[PDB]
C-alpha cells in the first residue's frame, strides 16, 4: 500500500522546491514536478497502478521515480495487514465530525461512519475499532455500547470524554487482547482526584457507595470551539497512530495506553492503567 | 515600581566602567558611581521613593539621572497594572480567527482586531500586544511589522509560524522591557549553521537561505482543519497566560520562553529564549 | 494438592497501597507486540547499526584502567551453554516424556516426599508459577485438547488450565517476531502472583519474585541443554493477550517471561 | 578491558522520565536493616506463628479440585539442592582457588576467547555486575588490604574496588540478622546499572535485569554445591549502606541481592 506523506511542492519564476518532513529538494525535472503536484492533490493512499501511470505519463522510470519519492519522504510503502479493518466514531456531538471521514483520509485514516448516540439499531462490523466520544458523559452510555458490541469478533473500543480541565482518551479496550476497559480508566482518574494523598482508593466510604447502582456523570469545564478543535486533532492523531499513516512510531510499551490532555496548559500525559480490582471486564 | 536590569561595574584605581545589556559607559562622576554601586546590590526591585532618595544623596539631578539610567539600560519603568490593554492578531490566514474575538471573551482574552497581513495601512494602538501568525513564513514579514510598530508606546510582539512538523510560538518581544526578538532566535540559529565548525551540507539552513534567494515563503506543510484547530487553541491559551501580566504580578520568564508543538505527537516543548549579542534589536 | 495454599489466607495480610503501587509500576513494562503493529511501533530505543557496540561488553569500576587480577580458565569444569535456539523447527514428534524430564529436573526435588526445590526463594514463599503451553500438533499431549497446563512442582503433576487451540497460544506468546522465532514445540510461562510476592516483605518481595523467576528459567536452560532441547527466553509478547489466552486473571497474576523450547534444523 | 563499554555511550539513549520512574519505584524496596534498629522495626508483615502455613506450598489454578496428571520422579536425574547455609563458621582457611573456581564456572565460558556466558541476557546487554566481598581474615586474598573486587566475566579477572576492612563489609551486608548468619568467608553482591538495564527496552528492561540477577545467583548456587561451599541468597541488608561501603554510586548502580558463601560446622 502506497501512503502519501505530508509535503509541499512550491514554485515561483523558474524555481520549484519540494519540502517534506524528511528532506528538501531543488526540483529540476518538469516530469517529476507534474508528478509531485498530482500526488499533492490526492488524499492519503494511492494505488501503485496509478503511481506507475503518473510516472509513465511524465516519462520517468518507475523504479527511479519511486526510489526518489520514498527516500525524499513523499510516500512510503507499507506491507502489514492492520488489526481493525475499519473505524467508527459514535458520539453525542456527531456534527463535530461532519467532515472528518473525508478530511482524515489524507492522514490514511478510514472512518466508515459517524454515528449519533441517539440512534436505535446502531450496528457495527467485525474487526472494527469503535471510538466513543462524549461531551455530556454518562456511564450508562458507555455500558450500553459495551453491552451491544463487546461480543463482536475482533472489536476494540476507545473512549474519550472530559473530566475537570482535562480531555481523556482511554487506552484501547480490546477483549481479544485482555486490556483494561473504560471503567478501569475512570476509576483510576476519580481516585487520583480525591485529595486524600493515597493511591489506594478503598475505604468503608467507598464500599458503601458501591452498594448503589453504579452510575455517574463527570464534572468538567465548559467547552468552547478551541477546546473542541484541540480535541479533534488529538482524536485524529490517535486514530492515525493506531490505524492510519504512521508518521512517528510509538514504543511497544505505550502504544495501547491512555492519553490525557490538560486543556489549560495543553500538556499531554500518556499512561498505562491497570485493571481496576472491582471491574469485571476481564471476566467477560 | 522601577525594575533594575542586570548590569556590571568594573573598577580599577579611580576608573569605573559600566556595562549594561545595550551600553558601555565610562563613569567619572563619584555620585553616579555610588548610585550604580548601590543599585548593583539591590536585587532587581526598587521603589521610586528609594531611587529618588539614592539620587538626591549622590548629588545627581533626579531627572537627568533617571533619563541616563533608563537610556543606558540600568533601569526600566514597567507598569504595576497589566502591560497590554488589548491584543491584535495579524495573519495571512485571518479567516481562521473570524470568531476568536467573540469566543475568547469568556476565557478573559480580549482581542480587539483581526488584521490581514496583506493590508496596506495597518494601525495599532498604544500598549497593545501584536500577535503575528503566519502559515507562510518569511523573515521580511516580521521585519516589516517590527519597523512599523517598535516605536508605539507600550508595544510588544509575539510571532507564531510553522517549521516543518512543528508549530513554534516565539517569546514576547518588548522594546520597553528589553526582551529578545524573533531574530534573536532564527538569525542566531542560521548563524550557527553558516559558521559550523564542519558545515552540514544538508542543513535546513540551505532551504531557508534558498527561499530568501528565490523570494519564496516557507509554507506550513500540509495543514488541515485539525492542525489549525490545535494551533488556534495554543494561541488562545498563550494569550491567556499573557493577559493580566505585569512585572509586579508576573515574571520575565513568562515572556522569555518559546513554545514549540510537534503537530504529529502533539507534544509541547517550552524553552528559554535569550538575547543574541549580535542582534539588531540591541542597537 | 497435599501442599495447597488458598489465596484467601494470603490476602489477609495484603497492604492495598503496596499492591496498587507495584501493579501501576509493573504495567509500565508490558508490551503491545503484534504482527499487525509492526510498522507503527518499535522495540529498541537504540538503532540496530549501533547495537553491536553495547552487546557482550564489560563496564568497569575504573574505566580507562587495565590493572586486574587475572584468573585461570583451567578452574572451569563446565560445558559451554548452548546458543539460544531460533527458527525452531517442529518436524519431529516431541514426547511428553521429554517435557516431563524438563519439568521435574528444573523445578522439583528427585525425592517426591520432599518439599524442597532446586531453586531457593525468599521466605520459602515461591510466588512464581510455571505454566506449560503446547504449541505444535507434533508435540505429544497428556489430555487431548488441553494446551495450557499448570506445573505443580511439589506434587509433581500437571493441572489442566485451558483448551485454547495451538495457533492461538503461539500467536499470543510469539508477539510480532514469530517468523524469526519459527515453530517451537512448547513454551514455559513464568508468572508472578502479586499478593503472594508482596504479603510478607512488601515492595522488596516484588524484587525477590522477579529474581526468583530468573533462577527458575536458568535451571530450565541448563536442564534443556542436557536433554537435547534448544531454548530461548523471550520477552517479545503482549502480556495481557498471553494472560487472556491462558485464562489468567490479570488482577492476581501476570506473565513475567516466556521461554520457548524445541529443535533447530 | 578488551570488552570495555563506556557508560557515556549508554547514556546517549537514556530516557530521563523512564530512569526517574524506575529509581523512584526501586527505592521503595530498599531496607533499613541494622542491629541498632532491631527493636523499633520489623521485616515480616505476617506473624511468625502463622508463617508456616504459607511456606513451601502450591497455589492452584482450580482450588478445591484434585484432578491432575501425575509425572514420575524416575525422570529426575538431578542431585538435591543443598539446604541454604546458616550460622556459617570461618575456622578453616578458604583459598582464592576455591573462589576463582566459583566465579569462572558461575559466570564465564570455559573458553577465555569466547564472549558468551553461561546465562542468557536480554539484548545480550548483561546489565548486572558481580562484586566480590571478602568477609573473613581466614579468607585468602589476591591484593593485600583489598576486600571488594569487581568480577569481569569476559576478561575473567578481578578489578580492585575497595580497601574497606573486613568488619565494615560484614556489618553492611549482614544487616540486623548477623548473629543468626554467623561468619561467612565471602559474599557476592549483584548490582543493577540502571541505565544499562533501561536504555534499549525501557521499563521492561528493569524486569529483564532483575530476572537476569536470578539466573546468575542460581548458577552460583549450583556451582557452590558442586565445589563443597554452603551458600545463602540474602535480602536482609541496608541497600544504601552496602553501596556506600563498596564505594558504589547510587545514582548509577544499586545492590539487588547479596549471596553469602562459606562452611557450616
Amino acid at each position: 500500500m502506497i501512503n502519501i506523506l505530508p509535503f509541499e511542492i512550491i514554485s515561483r519564476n523558474t524555481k520549484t522546491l519540494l519540502i517534506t518532513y524528511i528532506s528538501s529538494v531543488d526540483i529540476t525535472h518538469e516530469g517529476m514536478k507534474k508528478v509531485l503536484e498530482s500526488l499533492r492533490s490526492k488524499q492519503g493512499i494511492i494505488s501503485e497502478y496509478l503511481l506507475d501511470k503518473l510516472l509513465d505519463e511524465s516519462l520517468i522510470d518507475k523504479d527511479k521515480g519511486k526510489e526518489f519519492l520514498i527516500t525524499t519522504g513523499v510516500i512510503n510503502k507499507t506491507k502489514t495487514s492492520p488489526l481493525w479493518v475499519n473505524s467508527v466514531i459514535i458520539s453525542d456531538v456527531p456534527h463535530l465530525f461532519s467532515n472528518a471521514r473525508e478530511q482524515w483520509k489524507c492522514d490514511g485514516v478510514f472512518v466508515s461512519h459517524i454515528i449519533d448516540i441517539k440512534d436505535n439499531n446502531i450496528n457495527v462490523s467485525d474487526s472494527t475499532l469503535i471510538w466513543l466520544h462524549l461531551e455530556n458523559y454518562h456511564s450508562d452510555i458507555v455500558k450500553r455500547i459495551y453491552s451491544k458490541f463487546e461480543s463482536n469478533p475482533g472489536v476494540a473500543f476507545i473512549q474519550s470524554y472530559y473530566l475537570k480541565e482535562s480531555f481523556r482518551i482511554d487506552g484501547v479496550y480490546s477483549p481479544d487482547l485482555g486490556t483494561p476497559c473504560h471503567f478501569c480508566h475512570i476509576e483510576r482518574w476519580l481516585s487520583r482526584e480525591e485529595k486524600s494523598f493515597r493511591r489506594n482508593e478503598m475505604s468503608w466510604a467507598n464500599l458503601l457507595q458501591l452498594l448503589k447502582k453504579y452510575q455517574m456523570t463527570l464534572p468538567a469545564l465548559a467547552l468552547g470551539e478551541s477546546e473542541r478543535g484541540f480535541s479533534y486533532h488529538l482524536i485524529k492523531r490517535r486514530l492515525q497512530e493506531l490505524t492510519g499513516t504512521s508518521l512517528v512510531k510509538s514504543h511497544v510499551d505505550n502504544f495501547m495506553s491512555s492519553v490525557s490532555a490538560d486543556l489549560i496548559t495543553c500538556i499531554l500525559c500518556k499512561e498505562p492503567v491497570i485493571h481496576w480490582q472491582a471491574c469485571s471486564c476481564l471476566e467477560r | 515600581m522601577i525594575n533594575i536590569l542586570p548590569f556590571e561595574i568594573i573598577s580599577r584605581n579611580t576608573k569605573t566602567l559600566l556595562i549594561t545589556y545595550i551600553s558601555s559607559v565610562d563613569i567619572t562622576h563619584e555620585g553616579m558611581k555610588k548610585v550604580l554601586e548601590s543599585l548593583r546590590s539591590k536585587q532587581g526591585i526598587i521603589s521610586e521613593y528609594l531611587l529618588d532618595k539614592l539620587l538626591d544623596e549622590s548629588l545627581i539631578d533626579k531627572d537627568k539621572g533617571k533619563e541616563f539610567l533608563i537610556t543606558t539600560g540600568v533601569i526600566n519603568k514597567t507598569k504595576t497594572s497589566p502591560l497590554w490593554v488589548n491584543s491584535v492578531i495579524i495573519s495571512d490566514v485571518p479567516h481562521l480567527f473570524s470568531n476568536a474575538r467573540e469566543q475568547w471573551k469568556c476565557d478573559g482574552v480580549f482581542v480587539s482586531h483581526i488584521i490581514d497581513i496583506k493590508d496596506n495601512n495597518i494601525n495599532v494602538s498604544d500598549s497593545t500586544l501584536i500577535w503575528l501568525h503566519l502559515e507562510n513564513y518569511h523573515s521580511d514579514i516580521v521585519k516589516r511589522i517590527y519597523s512599523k510598530f517598535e516605536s508605539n508606546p507600550g508595544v510588544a510582539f509575539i510571532q507564531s509560524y510553522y517549521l516543518k512538523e512543528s508549530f513554534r510560538i516565539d517569546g514576547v518581544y518588548s522594546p520597553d522591557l528589553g526582551t529578545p526578538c524573533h531574530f534573536c532566535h532564527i538569525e542566531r540559529w542560521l548563524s550557527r549553521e553558516e559558521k559550523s565548525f564542519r558545515r552540514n551540507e544538508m542543513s535546513w539552513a540551505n532551504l531557508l537561505q534558498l527561499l530568501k534567494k528565490y523570494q519564496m515563503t516557507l509554507p506550513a506543510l500540509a495543514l488541515g482543519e485539525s492542525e489549525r484547530g490545535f494551533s488556534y487553541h495554543l494561541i488562545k491559551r498563550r494569550l491567556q497566560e499573557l493577559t493580566g501580566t505585569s512585572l509586579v504580578k508576573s515574571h520575565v520568564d513568562n515572556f522569555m520562553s518559546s513554545v514549540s508543538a510537534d503537530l504529529i505527537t502533539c507534544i509541547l516543548c517550552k524553552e528559554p529564549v535569550i538575547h543574541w549579542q549580535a542582534c539588531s534589536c540591541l542597537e | 494438592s497435599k501442599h495447597e495454599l488458598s489465596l484467601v489466607e494470603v490476602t489477609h495480610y495484603t497492604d492495598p497501597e503496596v499492591l496498587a503501587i507495584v501493579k501501576d509500576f509493573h504495567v509500565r513494562g508490558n508490551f503491545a507486540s503484534l504482527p499487525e503493529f509492526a510498522e507503527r511501533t518499535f522495540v529498541s530505543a537504540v538503532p540496530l547499526a549501533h547495537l553491536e557496540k553495547f552487546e557482550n561488553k564489560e563496564v568497569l569500576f575504573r574505566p580507562g584502567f587495565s590493572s586486574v587480577i587475572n584468573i585461570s580458565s583451567s578452574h572451569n569444569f563446565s560445558r559451554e551453554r548452548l546458543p539460544s535456539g531460533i527458527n525452531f523447527c517442529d518436524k519431529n514428534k516431541l514426547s511428553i516424556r521429554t517435557i516431563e524430564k524438563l519439568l521435574v529436573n528444573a523445578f522439583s526435588s528427585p525425592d517426591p516426599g520432599s518439599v524442597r526445590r532446586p531453586y531457593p526463594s525468599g521466605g520459602a514463599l515461591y510466588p512464581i508459577e510455571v505454566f506449560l503451553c503446547r504449541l505444535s500438533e507434533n508435540t505429544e499431549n497428556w489430555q487431548a485438547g488441553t494446551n495450557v497446563y499448570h506445573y505443580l512442582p511439589l506434587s509433581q503433576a500437571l493441572e489442566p488450565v485451558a483448551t485454547c487451540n495451538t495457533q492461538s497460544l503461539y500467536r499470543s506468546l510469539s508477539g510480532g517476531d514469530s517468523e524469526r522465532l519459527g515453530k517451537p514445540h512448547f513454551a514455559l510461562v513464568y508468572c508472578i502472583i502479586f499478593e503472594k510476592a508482596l504479603f510478607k516483605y512488601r515492595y522488596r518481595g516484588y524484587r525477590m519474585a522477579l529474581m526468583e523467576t530468573g533462577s527458575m528459567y536458568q535451571n530450565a536452560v541448563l536442564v534443556a541443554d542436557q536433554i537435547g532441547l534448544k531454548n530461548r527466553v523471550w520477552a517479545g509478547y503482549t502480556d495481557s493477550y498471553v494472560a487472556k489466552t491462558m485464562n489468567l486473571d490479570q488482577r492476581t497474576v501476570a506473565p513475567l517471561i516466556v521461554q520457548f523450547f524445541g529443535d533447530v534444523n | 578491558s578488551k570488552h570495555e563499554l563506556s557508560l557515556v555511550e549508554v547514556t546517549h539513549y537514556t530516557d530521563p522520565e523512564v530512569l526517574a520512574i524506575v529509581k523512584d519505584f526501586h527505592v521503595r524496596g530498599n531496607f533499613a536493616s541494622l542491629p541498632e534498629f532491631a527493636e523499633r522495626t520489623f521485616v515480616s508483615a505476617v506473624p511468625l506463628a502463622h508463617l508456616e502455613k504459607f511456606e513451601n506450598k502450591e497455589v492452584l489454578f482450580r482450588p478445591g479440585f484434585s484432578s491432575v496428571i501425575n509425572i514420575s520422579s524416575s525422570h529426575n536425574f538431578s542431585r538435591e539442592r543443598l539446604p541454604s547455609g546458616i550460622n556459617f563458621c570461618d575456622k578453616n582457611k578458604l583459598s582464592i582457588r576455591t573462589i576463582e573456581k566459583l566465579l569462572v564456572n558461575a559466570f564465564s565460558s570455559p573458553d577465555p576467547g569466547s564472549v558468551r556466558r553461561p546465562y542468557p541476557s536480554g539484548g545480550a546487554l548483561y546489565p548486572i555486575e558481580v562484586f566480590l566481598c571478602r568477609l573473613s581474615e581466614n579468607t585468602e586474598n589476591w591484593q593485600a588490604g583489598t576486600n571488594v573486587y569487581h568480577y569481569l566475566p569476559l576478561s575473567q579477572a578481578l578489578e580492585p574496588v575497595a580497601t574497606c576492612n573486613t568488619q565494615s563489609l560484614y556489618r553492611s551486608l549482614s544487616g540486623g540478622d548477623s548473629e543468626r548468619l554467623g561468619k561467612p568467608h565471602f559474599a557476592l553482591v549483584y548490582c543493577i546499572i540502571f541505565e544499562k538495564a533501561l536504555f534499549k527496552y525501557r521499563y521492561r528492561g528493569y524486569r529483564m535485569a532483575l530476572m537476569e540477577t536470578g539466573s546468575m545467583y542460581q548458577n552460583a548456587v549450583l556451582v557452590a554445591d558442586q565445589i563443597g561451599l554452603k551458600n545463602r541468597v540474602w535480602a536482609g541488608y541496608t541497600d544504601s549502606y552496602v553501596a556506600k561501603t563498596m564505594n558504589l554510586d547510587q545514582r548509577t548502580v544499586a545492590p539487588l541481592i547479596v549471596q553469602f558463601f562459606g562452611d557450616v560446622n
Binding site: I22, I27, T28 | - | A45, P47, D177 | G123
Partner: peptide, 24 residues
Amino acid sequence: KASEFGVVLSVDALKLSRQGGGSH
C-alpha cells in the same frame, strides 16, 4: 542523494534514519 530529478538541499537525518520483538 544525487539524482536526475533535482538536488537535495536538506535532510533531517534523525528522521531519515527512522524512515538517541534479541541481539544484533
